[PDB]
Design an enzyme around this catalytic site. Sequence first.
Site, PDB file in Angstrom:
ATOM      1  CG  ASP A 234      -8.038  10.229   1.910  1.00 31.31           C
ATOM      2  OD1 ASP A 234      -8.510  10.958   1.356  1.00 31.31           O
ATOM      3  OD2 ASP A 234      -8.369   9.305   2.773  1.00 31.31           O
TER       4      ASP A 234
ATOM      5  CD  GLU B  52      -3.173  -0.788   1.993  1.00 29.45           C
ATOM      6  OE1 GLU B  52      -3.063   0.049   3.002  1.00 29.45           O
ATOM      7  OE2 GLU B  52      -3.937  -1.727   2.029  1.00 29.45           O
TER       8      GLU B  52
END
Length: 364
Positions: free
Chosen positions: A32, A23
């Site tokens: 994000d 990730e």
Amino acid sequence: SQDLENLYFQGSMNIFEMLRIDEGLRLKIYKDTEGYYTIGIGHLLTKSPSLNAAKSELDKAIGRNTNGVITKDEAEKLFNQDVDAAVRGILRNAKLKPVYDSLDAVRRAALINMVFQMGETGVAGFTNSLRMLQQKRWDEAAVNLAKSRWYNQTPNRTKRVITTFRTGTWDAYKNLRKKLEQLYNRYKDPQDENKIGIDGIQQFCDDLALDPASISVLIIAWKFRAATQCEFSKQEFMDGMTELGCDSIEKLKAQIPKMEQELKEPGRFKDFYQFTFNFAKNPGLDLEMAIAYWNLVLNGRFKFLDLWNKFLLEHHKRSIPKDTWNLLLDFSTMIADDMSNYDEEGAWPVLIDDFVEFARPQIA
Ligand SMILES: O=C(Nc1cccc(C(F)(F)F)c1)NC1CCN(Cc2ccccc2)CC1
């Protein structure tokens, strides 16, 4: 307590390192895909639109004034709380607990990995595969897992996680790391093992079939979040290649068009453009270096790039500061073909005010 020394009895390879690869790991607050301040491995800090709020949350968590930058160890400590929460959720899940309990630590990490990617509901739909794992039917589980949309969505990651289920080893991760290391060793500076210097950067561009001075190479440095132009650190190379999902020059070559297309989004180009300033200077930007990079990144965006060149060549030599760099993009984006819509009271740098006057003869 949260001290990583508490975990020294474990293996060096762990779910943290696993997800660092699968990730990725950010050591500085970033937004994000939903625009929220996040850090470490996908650790949400706050939904607040205030960066200072994000930083205060981070300081609470880390126990120091972070200024929004944390160490890898600190990221692991954040991540470890996240994992504990995820594991508690697994243990609450009727469908996942039995499998989880049945599994050894390495395979648990694989399961936890799946939960991080797709959530408990996602993972719990792998009913057959889960049952096979539970039954230690690793090969069958491995095969069945591969038939899935998961596999299609993220094959590199999924193949690693599947290898982990199949073998109960970290072999997929050790293999990926080794491959990147052997790759890196092709470029590392003979006199500093932990960076790639001028020669290695050449070789890297040569292997990519790129002009070291082309925009592609800048775009790559941008994707690798490189700090500075004169060197290329081991960490940047490894994080870059891992983040881009490439274990070879072949693969990285293929990614470059994709990075270009990313730059078609104006926000992404803005990030790239502003990155360029930071990357270019030595730890303001030398005018000559600024012109060079402006010619690279503003070509085809800035309608007055040639004039800008001429303007700066005749204008007495001066450092370029960050906000001047930054605002030129705003200018370039705003400005009409004849500059008729220029606002002399828009608080543009004096250099850009000057430029607009200098450009009046060509405009007319
Ligand atoms: O890229 C450079 N370093 C670097 C650092 C970290 C990562 C990466 C990579 F992208 F490979 F990941 C590259 N240095 C430049 C290359 C061009 N010239 C001339 C130049 C060309 C165009 C405008 C200005 C200067 C200066 C040194």
